Amino acid sequence: IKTTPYLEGDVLSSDSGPLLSVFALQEIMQKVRQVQADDVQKILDDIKALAAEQVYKIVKVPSISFRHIVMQSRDRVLRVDTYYEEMSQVGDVITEDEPEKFYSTIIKKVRFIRGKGSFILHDIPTRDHRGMEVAEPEVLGVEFKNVLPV
Amino acid sequence: IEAVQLQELRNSIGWLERLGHRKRITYSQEVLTDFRRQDTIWVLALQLPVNPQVVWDVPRSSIANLIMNIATCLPTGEYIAPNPRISSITLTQRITTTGPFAILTGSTPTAQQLNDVRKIYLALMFPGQIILDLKIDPGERMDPAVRMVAGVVGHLLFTAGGRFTNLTQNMARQLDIALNDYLLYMYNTRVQVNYGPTGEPLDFQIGRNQYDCNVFRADFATGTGYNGWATIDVEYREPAPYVHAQRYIRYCGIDSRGIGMTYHCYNEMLRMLVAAGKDSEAAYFRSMLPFHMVRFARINQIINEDLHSVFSLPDDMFNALLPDLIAGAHQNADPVVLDVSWISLWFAFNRSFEPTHRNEMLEVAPLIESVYASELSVMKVDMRHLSLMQRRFPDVLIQARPSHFWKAVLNDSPEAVKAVMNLSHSHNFINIRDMMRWVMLPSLQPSLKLALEEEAWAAANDFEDLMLTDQVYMHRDMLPEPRLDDIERFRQEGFYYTNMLEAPPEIDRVVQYTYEIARLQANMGQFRAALRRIMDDDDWVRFGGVLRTVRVKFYDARPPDDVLQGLPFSYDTNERGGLAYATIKYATETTIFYLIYNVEFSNTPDSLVLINPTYTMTKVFINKRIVERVRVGQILAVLNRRFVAYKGKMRIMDITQSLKMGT
Amino acid sequence: LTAEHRAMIQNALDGSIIENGNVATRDVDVFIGACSEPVYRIYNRLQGYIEAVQLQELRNSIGWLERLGHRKRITYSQEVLTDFRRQDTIWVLALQL
Amino acid sequence: EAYATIKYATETTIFYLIYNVEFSNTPDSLVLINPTYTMTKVFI
Amino acid sequence: AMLLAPGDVIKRSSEELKQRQIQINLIDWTAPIGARESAVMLVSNSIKDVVRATAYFTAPTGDPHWKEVAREASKKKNILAYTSTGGDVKTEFLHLIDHL
């Protein structure tokens, strides 16, 4: 199935030409642009990427939650929560002049708090005790490897 | 995930097989074999039978739905001549008679001709969404015969009136004028004519016996002069998988569900020519008729087979599209108009669209439509929750508009939705009333994302939890410094500092500044003077009223002077003699820091000591226990959550990756 | 000025809100300003003529132009016959045809 | 990152401050927020 | 009605073209009686006449100025186009002009 020849310049040809869908997208975009006046491959590949969107994700170890700092004194240490520190920088500067920036930052923070907790454990690592089976310290949400020697 | 939803899986796979036997030409693979197990665990993150209303309840989205449908369902094809091997043969065989048909035939197209032909075919694919208009350049010269023949062929190629149209009144009147001009070009022998009283075109009678050709004049009430002349075109049958596209469209009243049949308009046109006394083009059309019929039959097939999706127009919209155009005031559906040339009609008449390969995105359409519906439902619930949150706290959340909410919720979104909505809203405008109508509509698409967002909004109802606070204070304090005189004493003790408050200050001995007070002081140039005067009395000042964002940091050596001398506002002097002396930004970066000095750094005291004593200003009181001095004897007290997990041999599965993998 | 007078001036100036209205079933924004008497009279007369002409005159003008083009065997441009019905354009008819 | 480098001054500025009394009706151009320590002195 | 053709064929065809009282303009490179025989106004190869032209005829020939004229003629939206089919150029062109 070959197309009939057509004249370009002063010579015949039988080239297939661009895809019909690409032509339709670019001509529709051109019509919209000329209407509003007074790249289609990007949107096609972005449709393709959106087709394979994933809402959750599978994990091997839970994300770290609490951490500790030595205080040069053996009696007490410092405990901090990594969630607050991590979530602190996700926002943006807020000005009363533009409410859209404020509400966009709030929406972004809500999206962050949604996306941080979306995880599923599959197979935790574990070790064998003398009579029972106990999980490794890595799977826990507390890191204290740097406070043990003191 | 703990719940049981096998019946939902059976309904979903039933919808798969329903669409499959509706679309049996290309869909064959089915995945019931994996579902008949009891070991692995599936997740139903997305629901397949999507409610169509959720994609049509959004205001002014016809362009976006059309563009996404044509991106996800349009195949590709080629254009062939009515008879091949005509390029090599001499034109002496091609032209044998005299007339506009003889002078036109034997020509060869250019690139623009083929572009206009494929534009005509694309417009013919969509019955109502795409309309055609003539592209007329005032400053051009053109032979009359091409206009004559283009009119006389476009009076038959397209359709008008009846139940749907793809023409404007402008092209209808121009084609009628061109047909009138063609019928009175006398190159052959003479034919008697009889003209009527009124003066609209085509109002005359020709031939030895009079023929009322004024019926051929275009009229959109019934569509007499085109393919919609007294022929049924839309019908209904056994219900479709989609509940909003129950219609079946056919052009010439034909269906292969047989070679050598005609219809009313073609026979009437042929009788009109044979009455006119021109037999050359009569025999020409008589010979070319089967090619015309088969091309309309197979374009009917490709229209009814491929372009049936959720983005197609609903039945009520399809019915009401034409009377709105006749009235002249579009309400909710707005077609887009496509320009085209004169010669394009004849060359599209000769050529036929021949699809060769289908669109590779056709298989994964249900995933795209489900994702789109879920995203729109998420936008709706975000609208509702932002409105409720703004209503909850009037004194610390500023009042806003639905347009700002829409811009904010559209900014944070997958960019396919952003792009299509931007194009749709650039083509047709929106209003506050439309947004209110959209937000009080109750249509929603259940999904995992909806439940997760709802529960996250429930967990985020506390504004103080999400690091938004208004308890910011300015007060002059002396920053302590390590003594450093005795190395053994510095080792024995330690340096720990923070700007955190264990308790808020007293009710008295403090004032409150809002936006307008500070703005007035800045306009008058008495802001810093007032702050210094009130600081001289050893009091505190609170910048309340508007929520602020607070960053948190840790340090060991001395931090840079930016965080020591940070100010909640920024001052900018303006030009002389203006509205105000200077402007202020009431909220800038505000950082809380925890200083825990490393002991070994005392070996190099250049990292610790400053040059002269300094002051720190900002102070934040937050009720959460972000940093805690804890005895080691209770350090295991944090372990109080219960977690569940699976085994290595256990496998999780989702229907999306099962569906996209194909055979 | 003093503090009280400047505060009153700013309070009065911030009160000039904007209202939404309609002209030929199209959205417009209306507010309150100050102007002299005859200039405002001329402006109001011009606005009234713009509102009044949109109903009957220019549609008949376009129809008569189309009829003249039909007689003279010349086809006019697509803009001059179809931008009439476009929503986001106001066609002021300074010259009745 | 032999701990640190020092370079001698690019330029030292000798300033004479003569505040206009006409600016007295508009403060925050002649007043500070804290007591401030100046360091550099030049003898000519 | 007028055409664009390369000067090589017109230099040969000028005698029968003048026989049909057709206007001629070239740039060198080194029995029932009717009113008029043909409706063609003129035949030319100049680049200045493409704005007024309504058709063109292409043929495999050697002409330094045919490329630009052919491209400008193809630039137009709705213009007649004819191509050579081999064989005899003379009879083909004569039939095309007479039967136009």
Side-chain angles (χ1 to χ4, degrees), chain A residues 1-8 12 14-21 23-25 27-29 31-32 34-36 42-48 50-56 58 62 66-72 74-81 83-89 91-100 102-111 113-114 118-124 139-140 142, chain B residues 1 43 45 67-68 70-71 74-76 78-81 108-111 114-115 118-119 122 336-339 351 353 356 359-361 367-368 371 378 382 386 389-390 397-398 400 404-405 408 411-412 414-416 423 426-427 448-449 452-453 456-457 465-468 491 493 496 515 546-547 549-552 554 587-588 596 599 624 626-632 635 638 644-648 650 652 654:
Chain A
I1 316 156
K2 300 319 162 282
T3 186
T4 182
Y6 64 92
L7 183 63
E8 75 282 347
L12 270 43
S14 288
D15 189 274
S16 179
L19 260 63
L20 182 51
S21 55
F23 172 70
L25 276 296
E27 172 285 345
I28 285 285
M29 287 184 30
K31 184 59 72 141
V32 169
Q34 65 153 60
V35 161
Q36 63 84 30
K42 175 43 151 193
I43 79 176
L44 268 295
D45 304 305
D46 186 74
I47 288 304
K48 196 61 163 315
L50 175 72
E53 192 36 80
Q54 209 150 29
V55 55
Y56 71 99
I58 61 153
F66 295 77
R67 75 179 180 180
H68 302 127
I69 297 194
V70 297
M71 176 166 108
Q72 183 44 30
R74 184 240 61 71
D75 184 317
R76 325 271 181 140
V77 292
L78 269 187
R79 183 177 66 241
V80 309
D81 180 22
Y83 181 76
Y84 284 106
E85 194 271 331
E86 181 46 4
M87 183 278 288
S88 179
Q89 292 84 300
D92 213 2
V93 190
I94 301 299
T95 310
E96 193 274 332
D97 292 345
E98 322 99 318
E100 54 96 13
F102 193 11
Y103 287 117
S104 68
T105 306
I106 296 174
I107 285 296
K108 258 179 156 278
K109 285 183 183 292
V110 176
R111 293 298 172 92
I113 190 167
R114 155 166 84 85
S118 194
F119 61 94
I120 286 165
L121 318 176
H122 175 250
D123 169 41
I124 62 170
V139 75
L140 304 181
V142 185
Chain B
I1 192 167
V43 288
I67 192 167
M68 210 157 69
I70 191 167
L74 202 70
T76 183
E78 283 292 4
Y79 322 103
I80 63 181
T108 307
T110 73
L114 183 63
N115 273 348
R118 68 172 41 115
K119 207 175 290 166
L122 180 69
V336 63
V337 185
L338 260 57
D339 58 356
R351 304 307 171 70
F353 181 68
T356 61
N359 216 310
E360 61 86 20
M361 289 195 173
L367 301 96
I368 305 167
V371 163
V378 166
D382 270 308
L386 294 174
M389 183 177 177
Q390 197 275 330
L397 273 297
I398 65 184
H404 297 322
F405 281 150
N411 174 27
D412 189 358
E415 61 285 49
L423 284 161
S426 176
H427 197 285
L448 172 61
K449 284 192 51 33
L452 279 194
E453 191 96 340
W457 269 113
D465 176 0
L466 175 53
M467 299 275 198
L468 295 182
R491 257 198 287 288
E493 286 318 322
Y496 165 82
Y515 184 15
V546 178
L547 301 191
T549 51
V550 182
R551 318 295 179 81
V552 56
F554 295 94
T588 46
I596 297 94
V599 176
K624 294 282 151 313
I626 189 167
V627 178
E628 289 313 311
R629 264 191 70 260
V630 194
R631 185 182 294 115
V632 59
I635 196 66
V638 176
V644 302
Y646 303 136
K647 271 69 153 178
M650 185 64 72
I652 196 68
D654 177 37

Side-chain angles (χ1 to χ4, degrees), chain B residues 24-79:
Chain B
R24 61 193 72 185
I25 312 295
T26 187
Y27 188 80
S28 51
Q29 160 77 356
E30 200 268 331
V31 295
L32 176 60
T33 58
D34 285 331
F35 299 142
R36 209 176 180 179
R37 293 299 325 281
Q38 61 98 32
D39 47 351
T40 62
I41 299 302
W42 292 271
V43 288
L44 282 72
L46 282 72
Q47 269 267 12
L48 182 68
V50 285
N51 199 304
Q53 267 198 3
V54 75
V55 69
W56 288 112
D57 285 355
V58 53
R60 324 311 281 290
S61 55
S62 67
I63 303 296
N65 296 11
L66 161 73
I67 192 167
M68 210 157 69
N69 189 359
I70 191 167
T72 195
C73 283
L74 202 70
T76 183
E78 283 292 4
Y79 322 103

Side-chain angles (χ1 to χ4, degrees), chain B residues 499-500 550-554 590-594 620 622 626:
Chain B
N499 75 326
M500 201 66 28
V550 182
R551 318 295 179 81
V552 56
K553 284 182 178 68
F554 295 94
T590 308
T591 71
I592 62 170
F593 47 87
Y594 286 86
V620 180
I622 184 67
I626 189 167

